[PDB]
Amino acid sequence: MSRHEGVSCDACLKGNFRGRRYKCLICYDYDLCASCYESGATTTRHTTDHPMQCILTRVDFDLYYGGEAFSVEQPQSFTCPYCGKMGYTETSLQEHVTSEHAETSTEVICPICAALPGGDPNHVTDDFAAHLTLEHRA
Amino acid sequence: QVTFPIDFFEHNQQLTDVEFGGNDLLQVYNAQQIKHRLNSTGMYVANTKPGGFTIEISNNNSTMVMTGMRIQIGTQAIERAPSYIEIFGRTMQLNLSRSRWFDFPFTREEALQADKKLNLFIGASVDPAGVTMIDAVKIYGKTKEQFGW
Amino acid sequence: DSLCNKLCTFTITQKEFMNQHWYHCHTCKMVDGVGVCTVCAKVCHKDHEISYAKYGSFFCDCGAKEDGSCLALVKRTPS
Numbered sequence A: 001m002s003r004h005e006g007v008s009c010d011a012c013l014k015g016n017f018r019g020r021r022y023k024c025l026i027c028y029d030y031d032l033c034a035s036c037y038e039s040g041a042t043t044t045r046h047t048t049d050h051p052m053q054c055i056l057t058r059v060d061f062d063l064y065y066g067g068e069a070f071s072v073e074q075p076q077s078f079t080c081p082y083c084g085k086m087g088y089t090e091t092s093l094q095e096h097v098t099s100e101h102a103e104t105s106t107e108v109i110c111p112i113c114a115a116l117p118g119g120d121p122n123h124v125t126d127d128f129a130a131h132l133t134l135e136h137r138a
Numbered sequence B: 001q002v003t004f005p006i007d008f009f010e011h012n013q014q015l016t017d018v019e020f021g022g023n024d025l026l027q028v029y030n031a032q033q034i035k036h037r038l039n040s041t042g043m044y045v046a047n048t049k050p051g052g053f054t055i056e057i058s059n060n061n062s063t064m065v066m067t068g069m070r071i072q073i074g075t076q077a078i079e080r081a082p083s084y085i086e087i088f089g090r091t092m093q094l095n096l097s098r099s100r101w102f103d104f105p106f107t108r109e110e111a112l113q114a115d116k117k118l119n120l121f122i123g124a125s126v127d128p129a130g131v132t133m134i135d136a137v138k139i140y141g142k143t144k145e146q147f148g149w
Numbered sequence C: 001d002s003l004c005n006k007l008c009t010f011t012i013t014q015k016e017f018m019n020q021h022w023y024h025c026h027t028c029k030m031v032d033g034v035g036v037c038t039v040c041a042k043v044c045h046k047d048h049e050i051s052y053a054k055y056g057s058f059f060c061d062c063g064a065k066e067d068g069s070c071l072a073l074v075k076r077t078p079s
Protein backbone atom coordinates (compact mmCIF):
# COMPACT_ATOMS: atom_id res chain seq x y z
CA MET A 1 0.00 0.00 0.00
CA SER A 2 1.57 3.25 -1.23
CA ARG A 3 -1.53 5.40 -1.89
CA HIS A 4 -4.01 6.99 0.52
CA GLU A 5 -7.06 5.18 -0.80
CA GLY A 6 -10.40 6.78 -0.02
CA VAL A 7 -8.84 10.14 0.92
CA SER A 8 -8.37 13.11 -1.42
CA CYS A 9 -6.53 16.35 -0.73
CA ASP A 10 -8.98 19.24 -0.45
CA ALA A 11 -6.62 21.84 -1.95
CA CYS A 12 -5.37 20.27 -5.21
CA LEU A 13 -8.37 17.89 -5.47
CA LYS A 14 -6.14 14.84 -5.99
CA GLY A 15 -7.39 11.42 -4.90
CA ASN A 16 -5.27 8.44 -3.85
CA PHE A 17 -2.19 10.65 -3.62
CA ARG A 18 1.22 9.27 -2.64
CA GLY A 19 2.96 10.60 0.46
CA ARG A 20 1.98 11.98 3.85
CA ARG A 21 -1.76 12.45 4.36
CA TYR A 22 -2.62 15.46 6.51
CA LYS A 23 -5.77 15.45 8.67
CA CYS A 24 -7.05 18.54 10.49
CA LEU A 25 -7.89 17.89 14.15
CA ILE A 26 -10.35 20.82 14.38
CA CYS A 27 -11.47 21.07 10.76
CA TYR A 28 -14.05 18.55 9.57
CA ASP A 29 -13.14 15.86 7.02
CA TYR A 30 -10.73 18.06 5.05
CA ASP A 31 -7.37 16.50 4.19
CA LEU A 32 -4.16 17.81 2.65
CA CYS A 33 -1.31 16.27 0.68
CA ALA A 34 2.35 16.78 1.53
CA SER A 35 2.89 19.25 -1.32
CA CYS A 36 -0.22 21.29 -0.50
CA TYR A 37 0.55 21.16 3.23
CA GLU A 38 4.08 22.48 2.72
CA SER A 39 2.72 25.21 0.41
CA GLY A 40 0.50 26.67 3.14
CA ALA A 41 -2.79 25.87 1.43
CA THR A 42 -5.52 27.67 3.39
CA THR A 43 -9.28 27.96 2.93
CA THR A 44 -12.02 30.11 4.45
CA ARG A 45 -12.43 27.64 7.34
CA HIS A 46 -8.94 26.08 7.61
CA THR A 47 -5.77 27.94 8.60
CA THR A 48 -2.11 26.98 8.88
CA ASP A 49 -2.41 27.35 12.68
CA HIS A 50 -4.80 24.40 12.97
CA PRO A 51 -3.27 21.45 14.84
CA MET A 52 -2.19 18.93 12.24
CA GLN A 53 -2.06 15.12 12.22
CA CYS A 54 0.03 13.04 9.80
CA ILE A 55 -0.95 9.58 8.52
CA LEU A 56 1.35 7.53 6.29
CA THR A 57 0.92 4.71 3.81
CA ARG A 58 2.37 1.24 4.37
CA VAL A 59 5.25 1.96 1.98
CA ASP A 60 5.65 5.31 3.72
CA PHE A 61 5.39 3.50 7.07
CA ASP A 62 8.20 1.01 6.46
CA LEU A 63 10.24 3.74 4.77
CA TYR A 64 9.90 6.08 7.75
CA TYR A 65 10.17 3.44 10.51
CA GLY A 66 12.66 1.16 8.76
CA GLY A 67 14.31 -1.22 11.20
CA GLU A 68 11.52 -1.14 13.80
CA ALA A 69 8.69 -3.61 14.36
CA PHE A 70 5.93 -0.98 14.51
CA SER A 71 3.10 -1.41 12.00
CA VAL A 72 0.51 0.80 10.34
CA GLU A 73 -2.13 -0.32 12.86
CA GLN A 74 0.07 1.20 15.60
CA PRO A 75 0.42 4.96 15.04
CA GLN A 76 3.22 6.57 17.03
CA SER A 77 2.79 10.34 16.48
CA PHE A 78 -0.24 12.25 17.78
CA THR A 79 -0.80 16.01 17.62
CA CYS A 80 -2.12 18.17 20.45
CA PRO A 81 -5.50 19.13 18.90
CA TYR A 82 -5.70 22.40 20.88
CA CYS A 83 -2.06 23.42 21.14
CA GLY A 84 -0.39 22.64 17.82
CA LYS A 85 2.22 20.60 19.68
CA MET A 86 3.05 17.35 17.92
CA GLY A 87 4.98 14.11 18.28
CA TYR A 88 3.36 12.78 21.45
CA THR A 89 3.00 9.12 22.30
CA GLU A 90 -0.36 7.89 23.57
CA THR A 91 0.83 8.22 27.17
CA SER A 92 2.63 11.46 26.30
CA LEU A 93 -0.46 12.87 24.59
CA GLN A 94 -2.78 12.00 27.48
CA GLU A 95 -0.31 13.43 30.00
CA HIS A 96 -0.04 16.66 28.00
CA VAL A 97 -3.82 16.97 27.66
CA THR A 98 -4.39 16.28 31.36
CA SER A 99 -1.68 18.69 32.52
CA GLU A 100 -1.72 21.70 30.19
CA HIS A 101 -5.32 21.54 28.89
CA ALA A 102 -7.42 20.06 31.69
CA GLU A 103 -10.14 22.72 31.43
CA THR A 104 -10.19 23.05 27.62
CA SER A 105 -13.48 21.83 26.13
CA THR A 106 -13.31 23.03 22.51
CA GLU A 107 -14.47 20.55 19.87
CA VAL A 108 -11.63 18.65 18.17
CA ILE A 109 -11.01 15.61 16.00
CA CYS A 110 -8.76 13.41 18.10
CA PRO A 111 -5.54 12.36 16.30
CA ILE A 112 -5.36 8.75 17.48
CA CYS A 113 -8.37 6.92 16.05
CA ALA A 114 -8.29 9.39 13.16
CA ALA A 115 -4.85 8.00 12.26
CA LEU A 116 -5.73 4.50 13.49
CA PRO A 117 -6.56 2.22 10.53
CA GLY A 118 -10.21 1.20 10.71
CA GLY A 119 -11.13 3.89 13.23
CA ASP A 120 -13.22 7.01 12.86
CA PRO A 121 -11.23 9.53 10.76
CA ASN A 122 -13.43 12.45 11.90
CA HIS A 123 -14.51 11.48 15.42
CA VAL A 124 -15.86 14.55 17.23
CA THR A 125 -15.51 14.89 21.00
CA ASP A 126 -16.03 17.99 23.14
CA ASP A 127 -14.02 16.34 25.96
CA PHE A 128 -10.85 14.96 24.37
CA ALA A 129 -9.65 14.28 27.91
CA ALA A 130 -12.58 11.87 28.18
CA HIS A 131 -11.53 10.46 24.81
CA LEU A 132 -8.01 9.78 26.07
CA THR A 133 -9.07 8.43 29.46
CA LEU A 134 -12.08 6.31 28.46
CA GLU A 135 -11.64 4.51 25.13
CA HIS A 136 -8.16 5.62 24.03
CA ARG A 137 -6.27 3.97 26.91
CA ALA A 138 -3.58 1.41 26.09
CA GLN B 1 35.79 29.64 7.64
CA VAL B 2 35.59 29.26 11.42
CA THR B 3 38.55 26.99 12.18
CA PHE B 4 37.65 24.80 15.18
CA PRO B 5 40.06 22.67 17.21
CA ILE B 6 40.10 19.05 16.10
CA ASP B 7 40.02 17.82 19.72
CA PHE B 8 36.91 19.92 20.43
CA PHE B 9 34.66 16.89 21.00
CA GLU B 10 37.35 15.51 23.32
CA HIS B 11 36.71 18.53 25.58
CA ASN B 12 32.94 17.95 25.45
CA GLN B 13 30.66 15.25 26.84
CA GLN B 14 27.90 13.40 25.01
CA LEU B 15 24.53 14.37 26.45
CA THR B 16 21.63 11.99 27.06
CA ASP B 17 19.19 14.55 28.53
CA VAL B 18 18.43 15.98 25.07
CA GLU B 19 14.99 15.97 23.43
CA PHE B 20 14.53 15.86 19.66
CA GLY B 21 11.45 16.99 17.77
CA GLY B 22 10.06 19.53 15.33
CA ASN B 23 6.79 19.71 13.40
CA ASP B 24 8.54 18.30 10.32
CA LEU B 25 9.61 15.24 12.33
CA LEU B 26 6.85 15.25 14.96
CA GLN B 27 4.35 14.65 12.14
CA VAL B 28 5.64 11.10 11.64
CA TYR B 29 7.37 10.28 14.94
CA ASN B 30 7.19 11.19 18.61
CA ALA B 31 9.89 12.87 20.67
CA GLN B 32 10.80 9.77 22.69
CA GLN B 33 11.02 7.73 19.48
CA ILE B 34 13.17 10.38 17.78
CA LYS B 35 15.50 10.37 20.79
CA HIS B 36 15.66 6.57 20.72
CA ARG B 37 16.54 6.33 17.03
CA LEU B 38 19.01 9.22 17.21
CA ASN B 39 20.77 7.69 20.24
CA SER B 40 20.96 4.10 18.91
CA THR B 41 22.23 2.22 15.86
CA GLY B 42 20.50 -0.11 13.40
CA MET B 43 17.58 2.26 12.72
CA TYR B 44 17.15 5.78 11.42
CA VAL B 45 14.95 8.85 10.96
CA ALA B 46 13.24 9.71 7.67
CA ASN B 47 11.40 12.72 6.25
CA THR B 48 9.86 12.97 2.77
CA LYS B 49 9.49 16.76 2.90
CA PRO B 50 10.94 18.26 -0.31
CA GLY B 51 13.54 20.95 0.26
CA GLY B 52 14.47 19.67 3.72
CA PHE B 53 13.05 19.47 7.22
CA THR B 54 13.77 21.08 10.59
CA ILE B 55 14.87 19.26 13.75
CA GLU B 56 14.30 21.07 17.04
CA ILE B 57 16.92 20.07 19.63
CA SER B 58 15.98 21.00 23.20
CA ASN B 59 18.09 20.80 26.35
CA ASN B 60 16.37 19.54 29.51
CA ASN B 61 19.39 20.33 31.73
CA SER B 62 19.90 23.94 32.85
CA THR B 63 23.47 23.32 34.08
CA MET B 64 24.74 22.31 30.62
CA VAL B 65 25.32 24.34 27.44
CA MET B 66 25.36 22.91 23.93
CA THR B 67 28.78 23.00 22.23
CA GLY B 68 28.55 20.77 19.15
CA MET B 69 26.78 17.94 17.40
CA ARG B 70 27.58 14.81 15.40
CA ILE B 71 25.32 13.15 12.82
CA GLN B 72 25.73 9.61 11.46
CA ILE B 73 24.43 9.18 7.92
CA GLY B 74 24.62 6.74 5.02
CA THR B 75 24.07 3.39 6.74
CA GLN B 76 20.69 2.82 5.07
CA ALA B 77 20.95 4.66 1.75
CA ILE B 78 23.55 7.16 0.55
CA GLU B 79 21.07 8.50 -2.01
CA ARG B 80 18.47 9.06 0.72
CA ALA B 81 21.12 10.76 2.87
CA PRO B 82 20.80 14.57 2.73
CA SER B 83 22.95 16.68 0.44
CA TYR B 84 23.51 19.47 3.00
CA ILE B 85 22.57 20.71 6.46
CA GLU B 86 22.31 24.17 8.00
CA ILE B 87 22.32 25.51 11.55
CA PHE B 88 22.78 28.95 13.14
CA GLY B 89 23.05 30.45 9.66
CA ARG B 90 26.00 28.22 8.70
CA THR B 91 25.46 25.74 5.86
CA MET B 92 27.69 22.75 5.10
CA GLN B 93 27.21 20.21 2.31
CA LEU B 94 27.25 16.43 2.74
CA ASN B 95 29.21 14.85 -0.11
CA LEU B 96 28.76 11.18 0.78
CA SER B 97 30.28 8.01 -0.64
CA ARG B 98 29.43 5.77 2.34
CA SER B 99 28.16 5.80 5.91
CA ARG B 100 30.09 8.21 8.12
CA TRP B 101 29.86 10.81 10.88
CA PHE B 102 29.69 14.55 10.22
CA ASP B 103 30.73 16.97 12.96
CA PHE B 104 29.66 20.52 13.73
CA PRO B 105 31.17 22.25 16.75
CA PHE B 106 29.46 25.42 17.93
CA THR B 107 31.12 28.79 18.26
CA ARG B 108 30.96 30.57 21.60
CA GLU B 109 28.15 32.76 20.27
CA GLU B 110 26.40 29.71 18.79
CA ALA B 111 26.86 27.83 22.06
CA LEU B 112 25.34 30.77 23.95
CA GLN B 113 22.40 30.83 21.52
CA ALA B 114 21.87 27.06 22.03
CA ASP B 115 21.35 27.21 25.80
CA LYS B 116 17.88 25.65 25.71
CA LYS B 117 16.66 25.11 22.13
CA LEU B 118 18.14 25.11 18.64
CA ASN B 119 16.97 24.45 15.09
CA LEU B 120 18.81 22.33 12.50
CA PHE B 121 17.58 22.45 8.90
CA ILE B 122 18.38 19.46 6.70
CA GLY B 123 18.28 19.73 2.92
CA ALA B 124 16.42 17.29 0.71
CA SER B 125 18.39 14.25 -0.42
CA VAL B 126 19.30 13.35 -4.00
CA ASP B 127 16.92 10.40 -3.79
CA PRO B 128 14.40 10.49 -6.67
CA ALA B 129 11.76 9.39 -4.13
CA GLY B 130 12.46 12.56 -2.13
CA VAL B 131 13.39 10.82 1.14
CA THR B 132 15.78 12.50 3.58
CA MET B 133 17.48 9.96 5.84
CA ILE B 134 19.56 10.59 8.98
CA ASP B 135 20.62 7.59 11.05
CA ALA B 136 21.81 8.91 14.42
CA VAL B 137 22.27 12.35 15.98
CA LYS B 138 24.52 12.80 19.02
CA ILE B 139 24.87 16.14 20.80
CA TYR B 140 27.81 17.34 22.90
CA GLY B 141 28.07 20.08 25.50
CA LYS B 142 29.80 21.34 28.62
CA THR B 143 28.78 22.47 32.08
CA LYS B 144 28.00 26.15 32.59
CA GLU B 145 30.96 26.56 34.95
CA GLN B 146 33.32 24.97 32.41
CA PHE B 147 31.77 26.96 29.55
CA GLY B 148 32.12 30.18 31.56
CA TRP B 149 28.43 31.06 31.27
CA ASP C 1 54.98 24.55 21.37
CA SER C 2 52.86 22.29 23.57
CA LEU C 3 51.62 20.28 20.57
CA CYS C 4 55.22 19.72 19.45
CA ASN C 5 56.09 17.83 22.64
CA LYS C 6 53.00 15.62 22.27
CA LEU C 7 53.67 12.22 20.70
CA CYS C 8 51.33 9.98 18.75
CA THR C 9 49.37 7.42 20.74
CA PHE C 10 50.62 4.52 18.61
CA THR C 11 54.01 4.50 20.35
CA ILE C 12 52.07 3.44 23.45
CA THR C 13 49.21 1.56 21.77
CA GLN C 14 51.14 -0.27 19.02
CA LYS C 15 48.92 -2.92 17.41
CA GLU C 16 46.74 -3.05 20.56
CA PHE C 17 43.56 -1.08 21.22
CA MET C 18 43.33 1.49 24.01
CA ASN C 19 40.27 3.58 24.82
CA GLN C 20 40.88 6.93 23.14
CA HIS C 21 39.34 9.61 20.95
CA TRP C 22 39.76 8.95 17.23
CA TYR C 23 38.61 10.64 14.04
CA HIS C 24 38.12 10.00 10.32
CA CYS C 25 40.54 11.65 7.88
CA HIS C 26 38.58 11.57 4.62
CA THR C 27 41.41 13.21 2.66
CA CYS C 28 43.48 10.05 3.16
CA LYS C 29 40.54 7.74 2.26
CA MET C 30 40.68 6.08 5.69
CA VAL C 31 37.32 5.73 7.45
CA ASP C 32 35.18 3.20 9.35
CA GLY C 33 37.77 1.06 11.12
CA VAL C 34 40.72 3.28 10.12
CA GLY C 35 41.54 6.58 11.78
CA VAL C 36 44.08 8.62 13.72
CA CYS C 37 44.67 9.89 17.24
CA THR C 38 44.44 13.53 18.30
CA VAL C 39 48.12 14.29 17.60
CA CYS C 40 48.12 12.77 14.12
CA ALA C 41 44.90 14.58 13.22
CA LYS C 42 46.40 17.85 14.46
CA VAL C 43 49.90 17.33 12.99
CA CYS C 44 50.12 14.42 10.52
CA HIS C 45 46.85 15.49 8.83
CA LYS C 46 46.77 19.27 9.26
CA ASP C 47 44.22 21.10 7.09
CA HIS C 48 42.72 17.74 6.06
CA GLU C 49 39.01 16.91 6.02
CA ILE C 50 38.87 15.33 9.48
CA SER C 51 35.66 14.13 11.16
CA TYR C 52 35.64 12.88 14.75
CA ALA C 53 34.79 9.18 14.71
CA LYS C 54 34.22 8.42 18.41
CA TYR C 55 35.80 7.80 21.81
CA GLY C 56 36.34 4.08 22.08
CA SER C 57 38.59 1.10 21.54
CA PHE C 58 41.13 1.97 18.85
CA PHE C 59 44.79 2.12 17.85
CA CYS C 60 46.23 4.91 15.73
CA ASP C 61 46.61 3.77 12.12
CA CYS C 62 48.83 6.70 11.10
CA GLY C 63 51.46 5.52 13.57
CA ALA C 64 50.73 1.96 12.43
CA LYS C 65 51.94 2.85 8.93
CA GLU C 66 55.09 0.88 8.11
CA ASP C 67 56.50 3.50 5.71
CA GLY C 68 57.36 5.90 8.55
CA SER C 69 55.25 8.74 7.14
CA CYS C 70 53.85 9.44 10.63
CA LEU C 71 55.41 12.71 11.78
CA ALA C 72 54.05 12.36 15.34
CA LEU C 73 56.10 9.27 16.27
CA VAL C 74 59.01 11.45 17.48
CA LYS C 75 59.35 14.81 19.20
CA ARG C 76 59.21 17.81 16.87
CA THR C 77 61.23 21.00 17.22
CA PRO C 78 59.03 24.11 16.84
CA SER C 79 59.77 26.21 13.76
Ligand SMILES: [Zn+2]
Pocket (backbone or CB within 6 Å): A009, A010, A011, A012, A013, A014, A032, A033, A034, A035, A036, A037
Ligand atom coordinates in the same frame (compact mmCIF):
# COMPACT_ATOMS: atom_id res chain seq x y z
ZN1 LIG D 1 -2.96 18.85 -2.44
Ligand SMILES: [Zn+2]
Pocket (backbone or CB within 6 Å): A024, A025, A026, A027, A028, A045, A046, A047, A050
Ligand atom coordinates in the same frame (compact mmCIF):
# COMPACT_ATOMS: atom_id res chain seq x y z
ZN1 LIG E 1 -8.94 23.08 9.68
Ligand SMILES: [Zn+2]
Pocket (backbone or CB within 6 Å): A080, A082, A083, A084, A085, A096, A100, A101
Ligand atom coordinates in the same frame (compact mmCIF):
# COMPACT_ATOMS: atom_id res chain seq x y z
ZN1 LIG F 1 -1.15 21.60 23.99
Ligand SMILES: [Zn+2]
Pocket (backbone or CB within 6 Å): A110, A112, A113, A114, A123, A131, A136
Ligand atom coordinates in the same frame (compact mmCIF):
# COMPACT_ATOMS: atom_id res chain seq x y z
ZN1 LIG G 1 -10.84 9.09 19.34
Ligand SMILES: [Zn+2]
Pocket (backbone or CB within 6 Å): C008, C009, C010, C036, C037, C038, C039, C040, C041, C060, C061, C062, C063, C072
Ligand atom coordinates in the same frame (compact mmCIF):
# COMPACT_ATOMS: atom_id res chain seq x y z
ZN1 LIG H 1 48.64 9.02 16.08
Ligand SMILES: [Zn+2]
Pocket (backbone or CB within 6 Å): C025, C026, C027, C028, C044, C045, C048
Ligand atom coordinates in the same frame (compact mmCIF):
# COMPACT_ATOMS: atom_id res chain seq x y z
ZN1 LIG I 1 45.01 12.97 6.00
Ligand SMILES: [Zn+2]
Pocket (backbone or CB within 6 Å): C008, C039, C040, C044, C062, C063, C069, C070, C071, C072, C073
Ligand atom coordinates in the same frame (compact mmCIF):
# COMPACT_ATOMS: atom_id res chain seq x y z
ZN1 LIG J 1 50.88 10.31 12.51
